[PDB]
Nucleic acid binder design. Structure first.
Lengths: 64, 98, 100, 206, 79, 150
RNA sequence: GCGAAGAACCUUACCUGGUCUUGACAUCCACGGAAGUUUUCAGAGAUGAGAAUGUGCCUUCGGGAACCGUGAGACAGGUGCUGCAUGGCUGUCGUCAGCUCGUGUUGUGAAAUGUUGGGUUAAGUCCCGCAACGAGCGCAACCCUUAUCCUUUGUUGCCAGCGGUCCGGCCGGGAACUCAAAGGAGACUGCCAGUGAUAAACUGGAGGAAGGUGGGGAUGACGUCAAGUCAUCAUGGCCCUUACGACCAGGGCUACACACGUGCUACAAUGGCGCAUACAAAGAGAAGCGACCUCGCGAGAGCAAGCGGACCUCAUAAAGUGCGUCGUAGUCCGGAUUGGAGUCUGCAACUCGACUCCAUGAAGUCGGAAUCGCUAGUAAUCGUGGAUCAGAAUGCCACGGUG
RNA sequence: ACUAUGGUUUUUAUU
């Protein structure tokens, strides 16, 4: 393994182990099919919204 | 190891040299090295949409990097001077390398 | 913007042609102080302030598209208040959208 | 304004543009100043010569233009050399020697800028215009339109309110991303006030 | 202080320092020199320094050298 | 407005062996280092267990079973008057709440490290003890202010 | 923290002495001469005098042209005033689903109707149905993009397979895997079964780049407020024109009689202090970014490699983690307005810039009733860059780490 | 509904 943070390296290794078990046996190509370990997750970052510094915590700026 | 990488700034002006970058290589010699993938820089600019106040919204624009290697594969000076004083496209900059 | 300001906007480089635009490549070699107690060149740096309403710093461009000196984009030759309308019209070399 | 303009984002993506040239950062504003001033010159000389668009190119140490018209004969004029008198002005504005040529545009009553030039006169003269608008629509729908709209704003019925009067056929959608709309704005002046007229044409997607 | 090796010198005042050598009794002269410094080889004549609406007469002592003419002619009436 | 995408469920904790502890390391989460979760497991399992609960299989779970919230109060109208009306606590909140309130008293001791100062107040919850038990006891007293309705 | 990603002069409305009047920038009747190049004097300078030297190559009685300067009358010029005058630009309820027209019916008539009812949806969304029948505008749909596939190309990258090896991507060179583009495909409740007015619509399974608005965005109905803007302009009024125009040399715009809307860092100890360490993008870079190295406590300066950026540099990301240490205290906490002393740039840093080293260690013991933000890569919480430009951002915008 | 209970904001150029 090379590149990126060690908690992402771990996630790429569970994918690699599942793809290697899929090369080993015709029963593993079934028993691992829907386990979710080759099914790429989406925690996809939203387009940065003006005029917020970070994410969704809205600044006060209101009274008057 | 001498390189002559071509850089464009308008994507429609490098769409005029798409064949001539291969014909130049087949006219100067026989090996073709024009094409190359390379990392693209987005070269982004972001701007306000209201001329006054209203800093609540901004819109994004791009120019990107369009790059072709060209390269030199011929040692003969009557061909090296034709590649070092070369023409292919308009609105361009050329990166000479050692 | 006043017509007097629209004229200063060009006059502030039209004589810099003679004094700075072909001389200021030597701003560290000829135009910079080097001697202590006994200068030997020996009063030539005053010739850099001899022309009227004109200096290497006063070469400021302001903005040609609109009457605002601030809010200019030098790499596209436009003001930020007109650059969208011009980039939608396609007038700007190389600058475009898709989209974001 | 409100409701998306065909000269706005609709032209800012995937469409070709009439000026096609480059410039370095040390003189970029005079390159944009000349592009405006040469087209502003030519579009006013040819104001009654059925002109629609003008393209601009900048070859090395030169400038080159093409003028698109539905009447080449009035633009090329006497002896077939009446465009040469235009070079001497645009070469002063650009600072470089100028090249000029023309091109014939087909189906004139299908271009929004030449259709506007068939109806602005009727408002300027203060004459009956509802059949001029029927003709403007029916001639475009005969030539090859898939939709057309025309709308007048100013002095209608001698009122003081911001009221409009129109004629349409085939439906011209503006909120469609791909519809490639041809849109002209026109205005006339009279001893009873100014009168505006807008023309929108649809021919197909992309 | 310094300025770019050795003291700042200001020329439209200096053309009088060159003649007051040979100094004497005269009226205080109007001067627009506000960044000029009070060094012992540039001082010699009576002067009135500009404040942005008037010229005010100013005088210096033997124990001061690290100062500028504008500090003897303040531009504020206060409030 | 009832249209929601949250509404998450829990499963038994892999190291605490219980559904009643399934949220124990996940509450009041801050700055993502998750250093309490790594420092609270096994390293307090024989120093919290001193006098309460029978065997390691309940001697930590007792600190979430011996202390019980039973009632929660909010003002409501009945028959012709307003009262502080209680609602009786269900099994899905019976055990997984009272460990959310000891973080106040655990910040009045001068006691070192988050896991060990928290477990020292949780060690008292196994015998129904605590400093300022307001969020359990002051609502129980208010749920005795009226005891019959309509 | 707005116009403005910068401000000594300049910018600039405000303002004070000097000063020009057909105007710094024009057009109409006229009009002088190489465009250029040096240099002197009064004066703060504007300004006013000059003192000298440039005439191409053609060629017709001639005369060219950049830039300067003139003879009459109209005028020129104006961050002067006026968005209750007009075109353009633009805000928000709201990205809410709503607003209406032609003809028939009813009523004497303003109008009422349809758009209401009945299913259903994010949605006047989709269907059913009536004295209503038909219809436009907006809604949803294109496109941008993400999980995949088809396809092509490869150094300055990456470096396995092949030969040689300063045994090293090092020399030849190539695609293990992967970085890396540049161009196309396609999703339709389509298929299966259940509910429903077998309509519309809703709910599981099969197989998916993505299901049943897949996720995230763009667009701004009719209008409200006669919404802010002549500080970009256009352009009609009201006014100034030996001036409120244009300038030189300087005050300011960073005043202070005294009040608001927000923000940051601490009032500890999942906190500080010291030492050694894991793993990121993204961006700018020839008066630029500056390596190796020396000098000073340090800003920064010096010698000086690379060079238009997958290359060299800005520039050993920080929190996180280990190993040592300090303790429940106004503290090793906390760092503030003056004080001592340097560095850098420039016409010039007292008033009016930014960085750096020393001394002080104040106030701060959780705020006066009272008030406010956020529901999944969200709350949390710690770093990083850039525009301007001779001279610097506790801002603004963008990108990651951890959740 | 157990929220025991309540007053102003100029006539005058305008929506």
């Amino acid at each position: 393994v090379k590149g990126g943070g060690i908690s992402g390296q771990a996630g790429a290794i569970r994918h690699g182990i599942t793809r290697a078990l899929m090369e080993y046996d015709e029963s593993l190509r079934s028993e691992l099919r829907k386990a979710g370990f080759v099914t790429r997750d989406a925690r996809q970052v939203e387009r940065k919204k003006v005029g917020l510094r970070k994410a969704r915590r809205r600044p006060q700026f209101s009274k008057r | 190891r001498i390189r002559i990488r071509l850089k464009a700034f308008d994507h429609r002006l490098i769409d005029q040299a798409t064949a001539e970058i291969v014909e130049t290589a087949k006219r100067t010699g026989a090996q073709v090295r024009g094409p190359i993938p390379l990392p693209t820089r987005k070269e982004r600019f972001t701007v306000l949409i209201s001329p006054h106040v209203n800093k609540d919204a901004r819109d994004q624009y791009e120019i990107r990097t369009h790059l072709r290697l060209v390269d030199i594969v011929e040692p003969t000076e009557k061909t090296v001077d034709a590649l070092m004083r070369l023409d292919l496209a308009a609105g361009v900059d050329v990166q000479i390398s050692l | 913007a006043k017509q007097s300001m629209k004229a200063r906007e060009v006059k502030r480089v039209a004589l810099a042609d003679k004094y700075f635009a072909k001389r200021a490549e030597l701003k560290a070699i000829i135009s910079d102080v080097n001697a202590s107690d006994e200068d030997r060149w020996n009063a030539v740096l005053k010739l850099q302030t001899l022309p009227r309403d004109s200096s290497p710093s006063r070469q400021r461009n302001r903005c040609r598209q609109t009457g605002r000196p601030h809010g200019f984009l030098r790499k596209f030759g436009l003001s930020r208040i007109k650059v969208r309308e011009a980039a939608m019209r396609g007038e700007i070399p190389g600058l475009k959208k898709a989209s974001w | 304004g409100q409701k998306v303009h065909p000269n706005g984002i609709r032209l800012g993506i995937v469409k070709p543009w009439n000026s096609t040239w480059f410039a370095n950062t040390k003189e970029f504003a005079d390159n944009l100043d000349s592009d405006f001033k040469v087209r502003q010159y030519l579009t006013k000389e040819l104001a009654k010569a059925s002109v629609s668009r003008i393209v601009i190119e900048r070859p090395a140490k030169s400038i080159r233009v093409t003028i698109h018209t539905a009447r080449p004969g009035i633009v090329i004029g006497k002896k077939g050399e009446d465009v040469e008198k235009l070079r001497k002005v645009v070469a002063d504005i650009a600072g470089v020697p100028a090249q000029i040529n023309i091109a014939e545009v087909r189906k004139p009553e299908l271009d929004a800028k030449l259709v506007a030039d068939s109806i602005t006169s009727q408002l300027e003269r203060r004459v009956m215009f509802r059949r001029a608008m029927k003709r403007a629509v029916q001639n475009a729908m005969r030539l090859g339109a898939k939709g057309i709209k025309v709308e007048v704003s100013g002095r209608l019925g001698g009122a003081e309110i911001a009221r409009t009067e129109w004629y349409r056929e085939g439906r011209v959608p503006l909120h469609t991303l791909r519809a490639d709309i041809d849109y002209n704005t026109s205005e006339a002046h009279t001893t009873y006030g100014v009168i505006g007229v807008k023309v929108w044409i649809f021919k197909g997607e992309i | 202080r310094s300025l770019k090796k050795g003291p700042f010198i200001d020329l439209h005042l200096l053309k009088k320092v060159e003649k007051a050598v040979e100094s004497g009794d005269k009226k205080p002269l109007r001067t627009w020199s506000r960044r000029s410094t009070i060094f012992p080889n540039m001082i010699g004549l009576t002067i009135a320094v500009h404040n942005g609406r008037q010229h005010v007469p100013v005088f210096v002592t033997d124990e001061m050298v690290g100062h500028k003419l504008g500090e003897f002619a303040p531009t504020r009436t206060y409030r | 407005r009832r249209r929601v995408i949250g509404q998450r469920k829990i499963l038994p904790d892999p190291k605490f062996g219980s559904e009643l502890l399934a949220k124990f390391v996940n509450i009041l989460m801050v700055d993502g280092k998750k250093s309490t979760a790594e420092s609270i497991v096994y390293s307090a399992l024989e120093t919290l267990a001193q006098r309460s609960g029978k065997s390691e299989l309940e001697a930590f779970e007792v600190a979430l079973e011996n202390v019980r919230p039973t009632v929660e109060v909010k003002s409501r109208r009945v028959g012709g008057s307003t009262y502080q009306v209680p609602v009786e606590v269900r099994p899905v909140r019976r055990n997984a709440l009272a460990m959310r309130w000891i973080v106040e008293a655990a910040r009045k001791r001068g006691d070192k490290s988050m896991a060990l100062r928290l477990a020292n107040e949780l060690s008292d919850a196994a015998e129904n003890k605590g400093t300022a038990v307001k969020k359990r006891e002051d609502v129980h007293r208010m749920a005795e202010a009226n005891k019959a309705f309509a």
